[PDB]
Structures are given as structure tokens and as C-alpha cells.
Write a protein that binds this ligand. Structure first.
Ligand code: HEM
Ligand code: HEM
Ligand code: HEM
Ligand SMILES: O=C1NC(=O)c2cc(O)ccc21
Ligand SMILES: O=C1NC(=O)c2cc(O)ccc21
Ligand SMILES: O=C1NC(=O)c2cc(O)ccc21
Ligand SMILES: [K+]
Ligand SMILES: [K+]
Ligand SMILES: [K+]
Lengths: 156, 156, 156, 156, 156, 156
């Protein structure tokens, strides 16, 4: 086993967070489409795809390090009941997920696994972009009002 | 005469429903255009055209089965006085139409007219898509407010 | 109500005639297709489409004049049992329909609704073109014989 | 062995019907070409090709289900002596074929082989289209006369 | 609530099977890539994508029927230790999946949800195509030998 | 009857051999596809098509000679159970078939039917090309081994 055991555990934890996000964002996307909020549905679909790509890269790295990728354990999805709750739930997931990424990067640095660190840092940048998007949407609801915000997300 | 008599009666019942829908949706479309709600006008125009295409297929099938297509009997149009009533009236019509489609499909299955069943199932899929659209629009009125909903349908 | 009440009644009468023609010509088209007389089927399809376009223009004018377009009342279709009867029935409809158009134009002129008159005159020109076609087809049956006439309308 | 034994027997029965049709239509096609009725020759060629495609799909399905496709048993060809007899013979064959298709579909439904049912329903739609063509041609002989009907099928 | 409760339960059962397959096939794909068997890796990737598309359609249908799609419950993945075990595990999963699909289709038919039945039949056709592929690969291992079979799947 | 009676009998015998070959090669093709030996499946499909083209030419010649083409009598297909047996069965058919072609050519020469002789000689050349292919494949099995030979025919 070339990989550090705790690096592989961290990568499996990040992978687990990505698997939650894939499903949460995909369901939220299709809920927004069901409600006719097609601009939100499309954006959230692309967020789900992005997490799928991150999961792929993590799986590939874990296998290279001779670990066993964990696609069996799926943690808790938090599905919102309206647009505000869904955006907030995605934000909660990302805030928790970025904390785990930082902890994983610390450990990779400590054991000199600089390539795993670089992979995690690229994922972290994408997740901070998603936090930027989510916080901005919640702010727009405050600034333009919920009804206007939803109206602006009806059409793609 | 090759067609089962009750199959032909069912197909003419579905055809009669299509003829109601053609006219109700065409009038609703032109009412929305008169009011300057051009996006609703255009969508409802396309709903009317889709029902015209279904009527065509039913007429063709009835003639193949050596029945007499009934284009004479036009049942009650459900014409709303405002956008919410018009959408609800279209939805009520579609719920009646899908009930009749299911009863026709049962009978086609029982007498082994599988090609008529397949035609009716294709129509049913299209009518359920219309129900999806209509329920979604009524939900959007609740989520964004009536005035915003109408505003979003002014421009094509 | 900007529209003259009797103008709107005349426009609804013309619209009623167009609704009969749409369905009569559409059924005749599909009967000719069922019989393999594809050239007649295609021509009659385009006659039906033309009447659909006239109906649309009438509906739009009635709504502009603040009348209620009548798409509920469908008058008597006269469906022929063979090619000669079908052509004759279409001709009967057009002869009756053009009489109603002339009466409507007289009234529009009387009350100075020159734009409604112009719309009706454009429809009248199209209907006289259809009479030209129909009389010519019936004459061809006399000149070339029924069997040859039908033969000449097998292929598109 | 995954296939239901009686499903495979039904599929081989349908395959046997297709093999009859392939040969009957191919010979009728080449008879019409020999007689200079090239449009009938070409249409009947394409009917034979369509049956070849159906046979291919049946063979593929039987092999997937771990049955033995029967390409050995060739039932009685119904070869006409003139155009009217050839068309009537094709029609008689197709009426027998659709009876067998309906019985096969019933059995597939009963044992939950829904993919075989869907294949057979697609074949049935194609055979009913052929019945439509054949009944139409026999009707045209009556409407335009035999000599005109043949004349109309000299040139492609 | 428009959906039949047991239909929704069946659709969520099928969805749960798709979620297992997505992850099992994605991991098998990346295991094959890790081992340098790039053609197997690519084929299995595309199998995983196809299951993703099926899951999407199921989620959309469940939401239309006013049910709650279950993306939370992930059943047992069947992960093989070598190529033969991985293919057999995929085959075992697919045989379970088609059993559940047939039971769902029976129920949809019984309650006249013909559009859900049509969706499930399309999924079933795709899963039987996968069974065809898998049985064929296991047969090829026997016919060409394991080492040759793997060699043939090194290069894309 | 312009054709020599025994020429027509010979042409019907060759046609009979072609009808066996069409079905034998088509089934063998689809068996190879079922087994994932796609290169063999495709080659054998094209052999079947080639025999279909020969059959067409024979049918056309027989009709020109005022004979009755025999598409009713189908002789014995010999379907192999594995690749070696299938190749050997195709070779057996071709060896028998070419003997019949030579006998037919002798007779055509004797009665001065040089155009039928030329047609048969063109078919004979194609059949000798097929013998060349078949003998070569059986030789390759001997030279590279069965498992390698099959491996080389997995991919198109
Ligand atoms: C008031 C009654 C109807 C109106 C106002 C109407 C109006 C129209 C209009 C405006 C079009 C588009 C023509 C164009 O610009 O190309 C159209 C197309 C068509 N209509 Fe109708 N229609 C009516 C009834 C029917 C009926 C009863 C049928 C069949 C039974 C039918 C079948 C069609 C078909 C097949 C098309 C062509 C659609 C396509 O493939 O593009 N319509 N109709
Ligand atoms: C006397 C018997 C048959 C004759 C004379 C015949 C003749 C032909 C001919 C002339 C073609 C067109 C080839 C070309 O120019 O491209 C053709 C195509 C074909 N035949 Fe046959 N055929 C026969 C039996 C069969 C059978 C039994 C099958 C399957 C069981 C079959 C399957 C096909 C297929 C799949 C094609 C290709 C069609 C396409 O996709 O373009 N045929 N046949
Ligand atoms: C570990 C779990 C999953 C992984 C690793 C994964 C991975 C991927 C990857 C790599 C792609 C291709 C993206 C691209 O390059 O364009 C993709 C596409 C897709 N995935 Fe997933 N996915 C997962 C779960 C899901 C789930 C649960 C769904 C739906 C419920 C889903 C639906 C899709 C869809 C719709 C596409 C787009 C396919 C297309 O139309 O091109 N995936 N996935
Ligand atoms: O998610 C997984 N990674 C593995 O290596 C594995 C093995 C297994 O038997 C079940 C699930 C999993
Ligand atoms: O054809 C119609 N034009 C209308 O304005 C209308 C209203 C109504 O309740 C039913 C039918 C119709
Ligand atoms: O294969 C055939 N050629 C023919 O002329 C013919 C006639 C018939 O009644 C049945 C079969 C066949
Ligand atoms: K607004
Ligand atoms: K003539
Ligand atoms: K090798």
C-alpha cells in the first residue's frame, strides 16, 4: 500500500460528502424543474454534475493509492421543502464539506502527500465558488424579495 | 368491418375530447394575445396544435378500422374569464380526457387491439405532460404572485 | 364595446362557417388518403389549413372589437360518401358561405367598419378560388370520366 | 435458460410467418417487374425487405432468450396468378399473421415478458400498415378500374 | 395527490436499484481503469451513465405524481475482486432489477398508470440489453480464455 | 416457353441452394453476434446478403425464361453449434453448391443458353471466393489456435 492510511480515510470522507452532494443537488434540481423554476433547476443540475466530476477524481486517486473507495455509505441528505430551505441546505452541506476538506489538506501536508493536497485544494476552490453562489442567492432574496427572486428564475 | 365496434366508440369519444380541447385552447390562446400576454398566447397555441395532431391520428385510425370519425359533436368548452380560471379550466378538461383515455386503453387491451392501445398511450403521455405544465403554472401563480406571473408572460 | 354589435354577429357567423369547413375538409382529406387518392387528400388538407387561418383572423378581429368569439356552436357538416359527393358537398358549403360573406360585407360598409370589410373581402377571394377549384374538378370528371379522374389523383 | 418456452414457441411461429412473407412478397415483386408493372414491383420489394428486418429482430430476440430460431420450416406460399389475386393473397397472409401476433402478445403479457411484447407490437403495427396498403389497393382497383390501376403502376 | 401510492413505492424501489447500479458500475469502471483494462473501464462507465439517465427519468416521474423520490437509501453494492466476479456481480444485480421492474409493471397495469408502465418498460429493455452484454462477456471468457479476454480489453 | 425446360430446372436447383445459404448464413451471423464475435457476425451477414443478391438474379432469369421460380422448397440447413462447426457447415454447403453450378453450366453450354451460363459463372466465382475465405479461416484456427482466432473476431 503506497498510500498513507489516514490520507485514504480523509479522501473517503471527502468522497462521502461528494456523494451526498450529488444526490441532494440532483433532487433539488428536479424539484425546481417540477415547480417551473427552470433557471434554478438548470444551475443546480450543473452543480450536481460538478460534484460527480470531483467524486470521479477522488475515486481515481484512492485507487492509485491502493485504497478501497467507499461508495456504499451514503450520509444524510437534507432536502428542503421550498427554494429558501433548499438553498440553505446546500449551503449547510458546503460549509460542513469545506471544513472536512481543510482538515484533509492539513493531514496531506503533514505526511508530504502534495498531489492529494493539490487535488483537494482544487475541489475546495470549486466548493468556495458554490458558497459564493449560494450566499449571493440568499442575499438576492433579501434585496429583491422572494416573489421577484423566484420570478427571475422561472425562465432559463 | 375490421374494427371492434366498442373500440371505435372509444376512439370517437377521445376524438370528441380532442375537438373540445382544440377550440378551448385556441380561444384561450387568442384571449391571452388580446390581453398582451404573448408568452401564454404562444404556449397555448402550441397546445392547441398538439391536440390537432392527436385528432388527426385518431381520425386516421378510425378510418382504417372502417369506422366513421365523429367531427360533428362538439361538447362543452370550459372558457375562463381570467388567467387563473383559464388554466384551471384547461386542467379540468385534461383530467376528464385522461380518465376517458384510461377507459379506452382498458377496452383495447381486452379485445387485443394493441395498435389502438399504443396510439392512445402516446396521446395519454402527451396529455399528462399538459397536466404537468398546468399544475406547474398554477403553482407558480402561488409562488411568485399573480401579477408577477402575468408579467413573466407578457413577452415571448 | 368599440365593435358594432351586428358586425360582431356577422363575424361570428362567418367564423361558424369556417369551423364547419375546417372539420368537413379535414375529414374529406383523410377519407381520400384512406382510399389511396393521395393527390386529393393533400389538396383537401391544404384547404382545411387555409380555413383554419381564416378562423384565426376572425377570432382575432372579434376580440379586438370586444366581442366573444363563438367556437362552441358547430353547424352541420355534410360528409360525402364518394369523391363526387365530397366535392359537391364542399361546393355547397362554399356557395352558402360566400352568400353569408357578402351579407356581412354589406353591413360592414353600412356602419363604416372598413377594416372588417377588408378582412372579409380577403376571405371571400380565397373562397372564390376554392369554388373555382371545385367546379373545375367536377368538370374534369365530366370531361375525362370518373375512373380517369380518380386515377389522376392517386399519386401526389 | 432464461426465455419462457411458450414465448419462444410463439416467437418462432411469428418468425415462420415472416419467412413465408419474405418469399411470397419477393416473388410477387419480381413477377410484377417481369410484367412491366415496376411501381408494384418496387413497392412489393420494399414490403419483402421490411419483413426481412422483422425476421432479423425476432432471430435476435430468440437467441437472447436462449432459444433456437427456426429458419428451416417454410409454410405454404400463397402465389397469385394476376395482380388482384396477388394482392388478395398478401392480404390473406397478413390477416393470418396478425392473428398469430395477437395470440403471442397475450402470452407474453401473461408471463411478464414485456420486452418481447413490445417487439411484437411494433411488428403488428407494421403489419396493420401493410393491411391498410393492401385493402386500399383492392379498393382502388374497384374505383379506377383494373386496367387504369395497372397502368398507374407501370412506371416507378 | 395524483399518483397511486403503491405505484410511487414501486418507482422508488426501481430508483433504489438504479442508485445501487450507478455506484457499483462506476466503481467497477474505475477499478478496471486502475488495472489498465481501459476498454472495460469505458464500457462500464457508459453503463453507469445509462443508469444515471434512468434514475433521472424515475425522479421526474415520481415528482409529477406528487411522491417523494428516495435518493437516501442505498442498498448493498456487489463489488467483485476480479473481472469475472465483477461481471457476475453486475449480472446478479441486473437479474434482481428486472424482477422488480416486472412486478412494478404488473401493478402499474392493474391501476391503469400506463405512462409509468411505459417508462418502466423502456428501462426494462435497457436492462435486458445489459444482461445480454454481461452474459456475452462471461461466455467470451469461456470461449477465448480469461487472459485473452482481458488482453482484448486493455486498449480502448 | 422460350426457356429450355432443363435449364429452368437447373436454375431452380441453384436458387434452392441459394435459399438454404441465405438462411444458414443469416442465422450463423446472428449466433456469432449473440456470442460477441462481432467480426464474424458482420462478415457472415455480408455473405448472406450476397446470396440474397444471387437469388434475385436467378429469380429474374427464370421469369424471363417463362419458368416458375421455386421459393417454396427449402432444403436442409446445417447449423453448427460452435464457430468451427459453423465454418465447416458453410464450407460443406458451398462445396455441394459449386458442384451443382458446374453441372448447370454444362447443360447451359449444351443447349446454347450462353446468357444463363454467364450468370451462373458469375455466381460460381463468388462462391469460390467464399470457399477461399472459409478454408482460410479454418487454416487460421490451426495456425494461431482456436482461442486466439476467436479473440481476433471479437471486435469489428
Ligand atoms: C377552430 C378550429 C381550428 C383552428 C382555429 C385551427 C388553426 C390552426 C392553425 C392556425 C394552424 C397553423 C397553420 C399554419 O400556419 O401552418 C393549424 C395547423 C393544423 N391544424 Fe388546425 N385548427 C383548427 C382545428 C383543427 C382540427 C379539427 C384539426 C384536425 C382534426 C386540425 C389539424 C391541424 C393540423 C394537422 C395542422 C398542421 C400542424 C403541423 O403539423 O404543423 N386543426 N391549425
Ligand atoms: C429469397 C429470400 C431472400 C431474398 C431473395 C432476399 C433478397 C434481399 C435483397 C435483394 C436485399 C437487398 C440487398 C442490397 O442490395 O443491399 C436484401 C436485404 C436484406 N435482407 Fe434479404 N432476402 C431474402 C431473405 C432474407 C431473410 C430470411 C432475412 C432474415 C432472416 C433477410 C434479411 C435481410 C436484411 C436484414 C437485409 C438488409 C436490409 C437493409 O437494412 O437495407 N433476407 N434481401
Ligand atoms: C458516485 C455517484 C455518481 C458519479 C461518480 C457520477 C459521475 C458522473 C460523471 C463523471 C458524469 C459525466 C459528466 C461529464 O463529464 O459530462 C455524469 C453524468 C451524469 N450523471 Fe452522474 N454520477 C453519479 C451519480 C448520479 C446520480 C445519482 C444521477 C441521477 C440521480 C446522475 C445523473 C447524471 C446525469 C443525468 C448525467 C449526464 C449524462 C448525460 O446526459 O451526458 N449521476 N455522472
Ligand atoms: O464501496 C465499496 N468499495 C469497495 O471496495 C466495496 C466492497 C464491497 O464488497 C462492497 C462495497 C464496496
Ligand atoms: O365559444 C365560446 N366563446 C366564449 O366566450 C365562451 C364562453 C363559454 O363559457 C363557453 C363557450 C364560449
Ligand atoms: O415458389 C413458388 N413459385 C410459384 O410459381 C408458386 C406457386 C404456388 O401456388 C406456390 C408456391 C410457388
Ligand atoms: K417583478
Ligand atoms: K387512363
Ligand atoms: K493473444
Amino acid at each position: 500500500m503506497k498510500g498513507d492510511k489516514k490520507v485514504i480515510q480523509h479522501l473517503n470522507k471527502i468522497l462521502g460528502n461528494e456523494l451526498i452532494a450529488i444526490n441532494q443537488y440532483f433532487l433539488h434540481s428536479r424539484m425546481w424543474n417540477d415547480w417551473g423554476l427552470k433557471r434554478l433547476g438548470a444551475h443546480e443540475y450543473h452543480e450536481s454534475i460538478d460534484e460527480m466530476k470531483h467524486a470521479d477524481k477522488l475515486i481515481e486517486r484512492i485507487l492509485f493509492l491502493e485504497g478501497l473507495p467507499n461508495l456504499q455509505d451514503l450520509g444524510k441528505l437534507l432536502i428542503g421543502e421550498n427554494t429558501q430551505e433548499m438553498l440553505q441546505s446546500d449551503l449547510n452541506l458546503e460549509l460542513c464539506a469545506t471544513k472536512d476538506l481543510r482538515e484533509a489538506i492539513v493531514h496531506c501536508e503533514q505526511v508530504h502527500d502534495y498531489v492529494s493536497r493539490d487535488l483537494l485544494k482544487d475541489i475546495l476552490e470549486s466548493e468556495e465558488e458554490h458558497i459564493d453562489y449560494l450566499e449571493t442567492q440568499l442575499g438576492l432574496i433579501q434585496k429583491v424579495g422572494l416573489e421577484n427572486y423566484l420570478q427571475s428564475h422561472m425562465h432559463e
